[PDB]
Every structure is written in structure tokens, then in C-alpha cells.
mmCIF file of C-alpha atoms and ligand atoms in Angstrom:
data_model
loop_
_atom_site.group_PDB
_atom_site.id
_atom_site.type_symbol
_atom_site.label_atom_id
_atom_site.label_comp_id
_atom_site.label_asym_id
_atom_site.label_seq_id
_atom_site.Cartn_x
_atom_site.Cartn_y
_atom_site.Cartn_z
ATOM 1 C CA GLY A 1 116.619 96.070 74.190
ATOM 2 C CA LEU A 2 119.215 93.186 74.574
ATOM 3 C CA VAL A 3 122.458 93.516 72.168
ATOM 4 C CA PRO A 4 124.827 90.853 70.986
ATOM 5 C CA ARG A 5 127.474 92.388 73.397
ATOM 6 C CA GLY A 6 125.528 91.094 76.392
ATOM 7 C CA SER A 7 125.924 94.292 78.001
ATOM 8 C CA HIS A 8 122.445 95.628 78.361
ATOM 9 C CA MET A 9 119.302 94.600 80.087
ATOM 10 C CA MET A 10 116.467 94.378 78.143
ATOM 11 C CA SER A 11 115.093 97.489 79.720
ATOM 12 C CA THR A 12 115.996 100.223 82.001
ATOM 13 C CA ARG A 13 114.348 99.900 85.665
ATOM 14 C CA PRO A 14 111.487 102.259 85.752
ATOM 15 C CA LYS A 15 111.604 105.748 86.976
ATOM 16 C CA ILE A 16 108.897 106.679 89.702
ATOM 17 C CA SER A 17 107.315 110.009 89.585
ATOM 18 C CA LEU A 18 104.661 111.726 92.000
ATOM 19 C CA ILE A 19 102.467 113.941 89.633
ATOM 20 C CA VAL A 20 100.270 116.536 91.406
ATOM 21 C CA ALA A 21 98.912 120.107 91.332
ATOM 22 C CA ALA A 22 99.712 122.201 94.568
ATOM 23 C CA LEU A 23 98.535 125.599 95.567
ATOM 24 C CA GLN A 24 100.705 128.524 96.316
ATOM 25 C CA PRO A 25 102.073 129.133 98.833
ATOM 26 C CA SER A 26 101.228 126.523 101.445
ATOM 27 C CA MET A 27 101.110 123.539 98.927
ATOM 28 C CA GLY A 28 97.264 122.947 99.426
ATOM 29 C CA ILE A 29 96.179 119.566 97.296
ATOM 30 C CA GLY A 30 92.704 119.386 98.422
ATOM 31 C CA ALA A 31 89.576 120.921 100.034
ATOM 32 C CA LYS A 32 86.428 119.200 100.943
ATOM 33 C CA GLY A 33 87.374 115.792 99.348
ATOM 34 C CA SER A 34 87.784 117.611 96.251
ATOM 35 C CA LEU A 35 89.738 120.201 94.366
ATOM 36 C CA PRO A 36 88.567 123.893 93.831
ATOM 37 C CA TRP A 37 90.187 124.359 90.300
ATOM 38 C CA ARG A 38 89.015 122.396 87.222
ATOM 39 C CA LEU A 39 91.977 123.151 84.814
ATOM 40 C CA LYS A 40 91.081 121.831 81.271
ATOM 41 C CA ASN A 41 94.578 122.071 79.891
ATOM 42 C CA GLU A 42 96.458 120.826 82.950
ATOM 43 C CA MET A 43 94.060 117.504 82.970
ATOM 44 C CA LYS A 44 95.119 117.148 79.533
ATOM 45 C CA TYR A 45 98.826 117.595 80.505
ATOM 46 C CA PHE A 46 98.052 114.845 82.996
ATOM 47 C CA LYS A 47 96.752 112.557 80.439
ATOM 48 C CA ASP A 48 99.618 113.221 77.970
ATOM 49 C CA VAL A 49 102.246 112.782 80.412
ATOM 50 C CA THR A 50 100.999 109.607 82.227
ATOM 51 C CA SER A 51 100.239 108.011 78.576
ATOM 52 C CA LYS A 52 103.506 108.829 77.035
ATOM 53 C CA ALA A 53 106.065 106.024 77.309
ATOM 54 C CA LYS A 54 109.121 105.189 75.066
ATOM 55 C CA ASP A 55 108.798 103.042 72.156
ATOM 56 C CA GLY A 56 107.423 99.509 72.814
ATOM 57 C CA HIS A 57 106.939 100.470 76.753
ATOM 58 C CA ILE A 58 103.959 101.402 78.890
ATOM 59 C CA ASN A 59 103.482 103.568 81.933
ATOM 60 C CA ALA A 60 101.924 102.700 85.260
ATOM 61 C CA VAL A 61 99.513 104.929 87.300
ATOM 62 C CA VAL A 62 99.263 104.390 91.024
ATOM 63 C CA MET A 63 96.432 105.549 92.967
ATOM 64 C CA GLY A 64 94.508 105.261 96.286
ATOM 65 C CA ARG A 65 91.282 103.550 96.289
ATOM 66 C CA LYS A 66 89.325 106.546 96.842
ATOM 67 C CA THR A 67 90.650 108.407 93.631
ATOM 68 C CA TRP A 68 89.825 105.092 91.888
ATOM 69 C CA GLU A 69 86.319 105.834 92.860
ATOM 70 C CA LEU A 70 86.214 109.332 91.530
ATOM 71 C CA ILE A 71 87.069 108.074 87.855
ATOM 72 C CA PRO A 72 84.026 107.786 85.851
ATOM 73 C CA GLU A 73 83.301 104.123 85.297
ATOM 74 C CA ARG A 74 83.482 104.331 81.514
ATOM 75 C CA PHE A 75 87.052 105.722 81.770
ATOM 76 C CA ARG A 76 88.436 102.985 84.049
ATOM 77 C CA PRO A 77 91.000 101.564 83.845
ATOM 78 C CA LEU A 78 92.671 104.684 82.410
ATOM 79 C CA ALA A 79 93.361 103.814 79.047
ATOM 80 C CA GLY A 80 96.810 102.897 77.643
ATOM 81 C CA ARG A 81 98.341 102.573 81.190
ATOM 82 C CA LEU A 82 98.785 99.864 83.794
ATOM 83 C CA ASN A 83 96.525 101.011 86.669
ATOM 84 C CA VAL A 84 97.239 100.002 90.187
ATOM 85 C CA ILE A 85 94.814 100.617 92.919
ATOM 86 C CA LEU A 86 95.974 100.830 96.701
ATOM 87 C CA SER A 87 93.601 99.469 99.574
ATOM 88 C CA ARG A 88 94.737 97.786 102.609
ATOM 89 C CA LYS A 89 91.850 95.493 102.049
ATOM 90 C CA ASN A 90 92.935 94.584 98.669
ATOM 91 C CA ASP A 91 94.081 90.857 97.857
ATOM 92 C CA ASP A 92 96.948 91.375 95.433
ATOM 93 C CA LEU A 93 95.162 90.517 92.497
ATOM 94 C CA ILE A 94 95.447 91.092 88.940
ATOM 95 C CA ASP A 95 92.161 91.185 87.148
ATOM 96 C CA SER A 96 90.531 90.371 83.760
ATOM 97 C CA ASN A 97 91.425 93.722 82.523
ATOM 98 C CA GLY A 98 95.015 93.754 83.820
ATOM 99 C CA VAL A 99 94.174 96.150 87.021
ATOM 100 C CA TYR A 100 96.252 95.525 89.815
ATOM 101 C CA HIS A 101 94.383 95.667 93.179
ATOM 102 C CA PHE A 102 97.256 95.588 95.876
ATOM 103 C CA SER A 103 97.374 96.191 99.582
ATOM 104 C CA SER A 104 100.279 98.359 99.558
ATOM 105 C CA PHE A 105 103.107 100.321 97.159
ATOM 106 C CA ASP A 106 105.747 97.839 98.815
ATOM 107 C CA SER A 107 103.671 94.561 97.736
ATOM 108 C CA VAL A 108 103.116 95.987 94.129
ATOM 109 C CA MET A 109 106.688 96.876 93.793
ATOM 110 C CA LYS A 110 107.638 93.534 94.989
ATOM 111 C CA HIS A 111 105.262 91.881 92.302
ATOM 112 C CA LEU A 112 106.502 94.164 89.560
ATOM 113 C CA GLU A 113 110.078 93.710 90.168
ATOM 114 C CA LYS A 114 109.536 89.790 90.317
ATOM 115 C CA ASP A 115 108.035 90.061 86.851
ATOM 116 C CA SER A 116 111.186 92.245 85.610
ATOM 117 C CA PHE A 117 108.926 95.398 85.324
ATOM 118 C CA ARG A 118 106.989 93.937 82.775
ATOM 119 C CA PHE A 119 103.208 93.942 82.000
ATOM 120 C CA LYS A 120 101.287 92.244 79.097
ATOM 121 C CA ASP A 121 104.619 91.529 77.529
ATOM 122 C CA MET A 122 105.562 95.203 77.717
ATOM 123 C CA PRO A 123 108.317 96.741 79.729
ATOM 124 C CA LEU A 124 107.425 99.640 81.929
ATOM 125 C CA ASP A 125 108.877 103.161 81.355
ATOM 126 C CA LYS A 126 107.660 105.221 84.147
ATOM 127 C CA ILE A 127 105.662 104.709 87.206
ATOM 128 C CA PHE A 128 103.373 107.660 88.189
ATOM 129 C CA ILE A 129 101.782 108.197 91.766
ATOM 130 C CA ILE A 130 98.487 109.961 90.742
ATOM 131 C CA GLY A 131 96.893 110.394 94.350
ATOM 132 C CA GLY A 132 95.011 111.221 96.215
ATOM 133 C CA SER A 133 96.154 113.192 99.311
ATOM 134 C CA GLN A 134 96.469 110.138 101.691
ATOM 135 C CA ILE A 135 98.676 108.362 99.177
ATOM 136 C CA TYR A 136 100.783 111.366 98.176
ATOM 137 C CA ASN A 137 101.627 112.048 101.615
ATOM 138 C CA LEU A 138 102.653 108.504 102.360
ATOM 139 C CA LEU A 139 104.673 108.086 99.054
ATOM 140 C CA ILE A 140 106.320 111.574 99.023
ATOM 141 C CA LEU A 141 108.380 110.122 101.879
ATOM 142 C CA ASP A 142 109.581 106.936 99.791
ATOM 143 C CA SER A 143 113.008 106.796 98.870
ATOM 144 C CA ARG A 144 112.049 105.182 95.509
ATOM 145 C CA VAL A 145 110.433 108.259 94.507
ATOM 146 C CA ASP A 146 112.746 109.619 91.804
ATOM 147 C CA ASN A 147 111.014 112.811 90.830
ATOM 148 C CA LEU A 148 108.010 115.268 91.542
ATOM 149 C CA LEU A 149 106.066 116.702 88.477
ATOM 150 C CA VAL A 150 104.483 119.590 90.455
ATOM 151 C CA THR A 151 101.880 121.961 88.678
ATOM 152 C CA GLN A 152 102.152 125.130 90.786
ATOM 153 C CA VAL A 153 99.002 126.698 91.008
ATOM 154 C CA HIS A 154 98.111 130.382 91.681
ATOM 155 C CA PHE A 155 95.111 131.742 92.658
ATOM 156 C CA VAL A 156 94.755 135.242 90.862
ATOM 157 C CA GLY A 157 91.355 136.334 92.042
ATOM 158 C CA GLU A 158 90.651 138.722 94.968
ATOM 159 C CA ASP A 159 92.286 137.390 98.049
ATOM 160 C CA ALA A 160 89.038 136.965 99.956
ATOM 161 C CA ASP A 161 88.037 134.613 97.448
ATOM 162 C CA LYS A 162 91.039 132.350 97.567
ATOM 163 C CA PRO A 163 89.889 128.764 98.334
ATOM 164 C CA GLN A 164 90.536 127.476 101.744
ATOM 165 C CA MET A 165 92.243 124.183 101.289
ATOM 166 C CA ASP A 166 92.329 121.559 104.235
ATOM 167 C CA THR A 167 94.867 118.998 102.949
ATOM 168 C CA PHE A 168 98.378 119.760 102.047
ATOM 169 C CA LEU A 169 101.407 118.093 100.392
ATOM 170 C CA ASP A 170 103.831 116.975 103.078
ATOM 171 C CA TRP A 171 106.783 118.353 100.895
ATOM 172 C CA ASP A 172 110.070 119.290 102.425
ATOM 173 C CA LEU A 173 111.672 121.447 100.151
ATOM 174 C CA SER A 174 115.361 120.893 101.525
ATOM 175 C CA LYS A 175 114.990 117.464 99.926
ATOM 176 C CA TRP A 176 114.271 118.406 96.605
ATOM 177 C CA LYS A 177 115.604 120.614 93.773
ATOM 178 C CA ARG A 178 113.652 122.198 90.738
ATOM 179 C CA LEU A 179 114.980 121.336 87.435
ATOM 180 C CA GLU A 180 115.035 123.528 84.305
ATOM 181 C CA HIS A 181 112.214 123.306 81.587
ATOM 182 C CA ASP A 182 114.343 121.285 79.051
ATOM 183 C CA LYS A 183 114.864 118.445 81.843
ATOM 184 C CA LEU A 184 111.054 118.543 82.380
ATOM 185 C CA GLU A 185 110.367 118.096 78.437
ATOM 186 C CA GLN A 186 113.045 115.404 77.932
ATOM 187 C CA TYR A 187 111.534 113.474 80.938
ATOM 188 C CA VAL A 188 107.794 113.576 79.804
ATOM 189 C CA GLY A 189 108.637 113.275 76.341
ATOM 190 C CA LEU A 190 106.437 116.073 75.171
ATOM 191 C CA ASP A 191 106.533 119.860 74.123
ATOM 192 C CA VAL A 192 105.340 121.473 77.417
ATOM 193 C CA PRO A 193 104.306 125.249 77.534
ATOM 194 C CA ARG A 194 106.538 127.388 79.535
ATOM 195 C CA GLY A 195 105.496 129.832 82.140
ATOM 196 C CA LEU A 196 102.136 130.780 83.509
ATOM 197 C CA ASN A 197 99.156 129.311 81.837
ATOM 198 C CA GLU A 198 95.892 130.984 82.344
ATOM 199 C CA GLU A 199 92.412 129.572 83.059
ATOM 200 C CA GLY A 200 89.785 131.541 84.986
ATOM 201 C CA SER A 201 90.942 132.625 88.451
ATOM 202 C CA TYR A 202 93.973 130.458 88.132
ATOM 203 C CA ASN A 203 97.223 130.452 86.660
ATOM 204 C CA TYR A 204 99.717 127.485 86.626
ATOM 205 C CA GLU A 205 103.096 126.440 85.863
ATOM 206 C CA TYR A 206 104.470 122.865 85.223
ATOM 207 C CA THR A 207 107.590 121.984 87.212
ATOM 208 C CA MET A 208 109.802 119.114 87.720
ATOM 209 C CA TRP A 209 111.812 118.375 90.773
ATOM 210 C CA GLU A 210 114.717 115.719 91.631
ATOM 211 C CA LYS A 211 115.990 114.922 95.060
ATOM 212 C CA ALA A 212 118.693 117.053 96.459
HETATM 213 N N1 LIG B 1 95.937 117.990 93.895
HETATM 214 C C1 LIG B 1 95.999 117.118 93.061
HETATM 215 O O1 LIG B 1 96.564 117.204 92.092
HETATM 216 C C2 LIG B 1 94.875 115.947 93.246
HETATM 217 C C3 LIG B 1 94.326 116.122 94.536
HETATM 218 N N2 LIG B 1 93.486 115.086 94.915
HETATM 219 C C4 LIG B 1 92.723 115.090 96.140
HETATM 220 O O2 LIG B 1 92.848 113.821 96.909
HETATM 221 C C5 LIG B 1 91.817 113.745 97.902
HETATM 222 C C6 LIG B 1 91.445 112.552 97.887
HETATM 223 O O3 LIG B 1 92.553 112.083 98.646
HETATM 224 P P1 LIG B 1 92.177 110.848 99.537
HETATM 225 O O4 LIG B 1 90.371 110.954 100.128
HETATM 226 O O5 LIG B 1 93.214 110.971 100.571
HETATM 227 O O6 LIG B 1 91.730 109.465 98.955
HETATM 228 P P2 LIG B 1 93.136 108.543 98.403
HETATM 229 O O7 LIG B 1 93.231 108.471 97.054
HETATM 230 O O8 LIG B 1 94.659 109.003 98.865
HETATM 231 O O9 LIG B 1 92.723 106.983 98.796
HETATM 232 C C7 LIG B 1 92.793 106.954 100.215
HETATM 233 C C8 LIG B 1 92.546 105.484 100.686
HETATM 234 O O10 LIG B 1 93.822 104.968 100.260
HETATM 235 C C9 LIG B 1 94.014 103.732 101.206
HETATM 236 N N3 LIG B 1 94.986 103.664 101.797
HETATM 237 C C10 LIG B 1 95.543 104.559 103.057
HETATM 238 N N4 LIG B 1 96.784 104.454 103.340
HETATM 239 C C11 LIG B 1 97.417 103.070 102.677
HETATM 240 C C12 LIG B 1 98.316 102.310 102.667
HETATM 241 N N5 LIG B 1 99.436 102.703 103.509
HETATM 242 N N6 LIG B 1 98.564 101.289 101.810
HETATM 243 C C13 LIG B 1 97.683 101.155 101.237
HETATM 244 N N7 LIG B 1 96.436 101.844 100.899
HETATM 245 C C14 LIG B 1 96.368 102.682 101.635
HETATM 246 C C15 LIG B 1 92.780 103.867 102.261
HETATM 247 O O11 LIG B 1 91.768 102.859 101.852
HETATM 248 P P3 LIG B 1 91.865 101.372 102.844
HETATM 249 O O12 LIG B 1 91.415 101.838 104.161
HETATM 250 O O13 LIG B 1 90.979 100.561 101.808
HETATM 251 O O14 LIG B 1 93.271 100.956 102.615
HETATM 252 C C16 LIG B 1 92.423 105.243 102.061
HETATM 253 O O15 LIG B 1 90.886 105.420 102.311
HETATM 254 C C17 LIG B 1 90.401 114.983 97.167
HETATM 255 O O16 LIG B 1 90.746 116.217 97.838
HETATM 256 C C18 LIG B 1 91.133 115.072 95.542
HETATM 257 O O17 LIG B 1 90.880 116.340 95.129
HETATM 258 C C19 LIG B 1 93.567 113.781 94.148
HETATM 259 C C20 LIG B 1 94.027 113.784 93.061
HETATM 260 C C21 LIG B 1 95.164 114.767 92.403
#
């Protein structure tokens, strides 16, 4: 935080991550309004990563309206995190549980900046964009996104049984560069398994990318 020297701001400005699982090779991120894989350890990774903040800080999760509707009521808002829901019909309100119902990523970022990136008298550490496909494909083009946390998902059943995806991440690889595993662990603040994790007909690898 602040020091007697007067040289440091109270907190660093929060990094923005887009966290997503994408099917190889064509970056499929949805099928028929859902997702064809259900990976228990990957869902735990999402919980652990989005919840892990440096001491005295909290993280934010930013999601589209349709994804908010698919979180079970008893688990909303996602505990231990600033929840932001995007809908163009929202009225830019912060409700009785501290949930931000905002009309655009621009509007919520403007508000957070006005508040010195603080919430419930906690500074923000990381802001995670958590989906769904429409919000991912809008915000992956936003210059404020600092990194991608991509779970690379591989189908390892028979070729004919691979799920047919119908929504894909608008990810231009020329704009991004994969980092080594130590950088991923240092960013997320956790010990993360390296390599291909196995569950059923899928394997999956945790990766991090920054801008080229
Ligand atoms: N691969 C992965 O890791 C993940 C994939 N998914 C997949 O995502 C899919 C669902 O995603 P989707 O249906 O696209 O729903 P989203 O969660 O992306 O929410 C879509 C809604 O966001 C609002 N919206 C759209 N553009 C804007 C904007 N510019 N500013 C503000 N609000 C906006 C709209 O509601 P309004 O009209 O009210 O503005 C729209 O209906 C499912 O297939 C799910 O499995 C979800 C999570 C993780």
C-alpha cells in the first residue's frame, strides 16, 4: 500500500484476464448453448484461479447475462468475488449484495476507475472475463485485456464421436504469445499441474498468453 516515501499508489491497477476452455484445433467454445465436456478438475481450477487474490484484495468476475442465468441460484453471486453481469438493458446498479448489473464493459470499467478500483473497501487484484461466447468474442478484441488463460481441450475418443461445436473463440494467434508454465503459476498464485490432464474422452492443458 502507501508508504512514507509517497512513491507508491495504494494498489496496482488490476490486470484483466479472459479465462476460457477451447477445443482443439478450431477453438470451439460452445455447442447448442452448452458445452460438451464436463471437467471436474478444470471447474475447480476456475474456482481456485478466479478466487485467488493477493492479501487484502479481491478479484472480479465479469459475465454476460445468459451465463449469469446458468449459475445455480444458491451459488450466485459467485462467492468471494466481485460479480459483474453485462446486459444492454441493465441500469448500471450495484445491488444489496454488491452485485454490479451494468450495461457494458465500458460503463463498469468507468465506474471502477472512478472508485479507484476498490470494492467493499478492498482493492481489486484481477478482473476475469468468464464468458459466455458473446461476451468472450466482444471482449477478446478489447485492448484492455492483458492476458488469456486458455484451457486447451483435446477430444481423445474416436474421430467420428468428436462433438460438433457451433461457436468459436475469435482468437487471432498473431496478436498473442504463449508464456511458460512458471509465468502462469506466478500470475494465478497457485500450483498448477503441468501437461495433459485426463478426464474421460478429453485431455486438457492449462495455458497463459499475453499480447505480442
Ligand atoms: N468455453 C468456455 O469456457 C465457456 C463457454 N461458455 C458457453 O457460452 C455459451 C453461452 O454464451 P452466450 O449465449 O453467448 O451468452 P453470454 O453469457 O455471452 O451473454 C449473452 C448476453 O450478453 C448480453 N450482451 C451482448 N452484447 C453485449 C454488449 N455489447 N454489452 C453488454 N451486454 C451485452 C446480451 O444480453 P442483452 O440483450 O440483455 O444485452 C446477450 O444476450 C454456452 O454455449 C456456454 O457453454 C460459457 C462459459 C465458459
